[PDB]
């Protein structure tokens, strides 16, 4: 069973918060909600369908993008370590504006496929955690 406003699917609880936040803050926020909570992770088409369905039913009409837990672990600006000529990418002037190490879902596709995105954007997000029994 789960808190009010939270949905129970399979063995976890999900909830979309219509508060605009960047990936880090969203993830931190989620961990405060409950033990083991994090930004939602989609581990199967069935869960993908459910999460999409839920977002559709509770997101604010103004908002259109929602954050999910996928993030790039690499420390470099982008993940290509070599240029087409074989040399290493030891010098990198990519603009922060173009560093897209986070992910999200969008209304334009029924909240289904995953899209890469800047981690400094402030958007709604869905949390997920496993309730105890």
């Amino acid at each position: 069973h789960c808190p009010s406003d939270w949905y129970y699917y399979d063995q976890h609880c999900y909830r979309i918060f219509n508060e605009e936040m960047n990936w880090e803050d969203a993830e931190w926020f989620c961990t405060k909600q409950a033990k083991g909570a994090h930004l939602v992770s989609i581990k199967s088409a069935k869960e993908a369908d459910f999460v999409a369905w839920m977002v559709t039913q509770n997101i604010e009409e103004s908002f259109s993008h929602v954050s999910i837990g996928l993030r790039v672990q690499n420390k470099e600006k982008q993940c290509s370590t070599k240029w087409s000529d074989g040399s290493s990418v030891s010098y990198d002037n990519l603009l922060d504006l173009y560093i897209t190490k986070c992910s999200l879902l969008k209304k334009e596709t029924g909240f289904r496929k995953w899209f890469v995105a800047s981690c400094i954007g402030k958007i709604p997000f869905v949390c997920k955690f496993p309730p105890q029994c």
Partner: protein, 124 residues
């Protein structure tokens, strides 16, 4: 060692800008056919970027040109904040490649299927 005619030289490498607008993959293959050791430009210093930017600004009418790095986000190590690894995947097919500006030393990206001008480079 000298550079072939119609090619510019910097450090110990040879550069040449091409106006034809091609996709990333095509530009790279094209460079490959222009000379031995030739490929899309690669950069290893600010001074070098400066050089191709000046060289490129005085020849190209466009504003952006392809650089030798592709699929910059496909190679990444993605992980769920919950620690686990993305076994099941539902990504949206996307391929970003790097491009340079003709008025600055900063770089950006663009879908690799897009069409821009470019510059080739080779050693010796």
């Amino acid at each position: 060692f000298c550079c072939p005619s119609h090619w510019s030289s910097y450090d110990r490498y040879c550069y040449k800008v091409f106006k034809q607008e091609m996709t990333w993959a095509d530009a790279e293959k094209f460079c490959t056919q222009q000379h031995t050791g030739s490929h899309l430009v690669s950069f290893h210093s600010t001074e070098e970027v400066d050089f191709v930017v000046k060289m490129t600004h005085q020849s190209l009418k466009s504003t952006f040109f392809w650089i030798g790095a592709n699929n910059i986000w496909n190679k990444c190590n993605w992980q769920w904040s919950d620690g686990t690894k993305p076994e099941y995947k539902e990504w949206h097919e996307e391929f970003e490649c790097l491009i340079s500006r003709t008025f600055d030393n900063q770089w950006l990206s663009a879908p690799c299927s897009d069409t821009y001008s470019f510059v080739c480079k080779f050693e010796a």
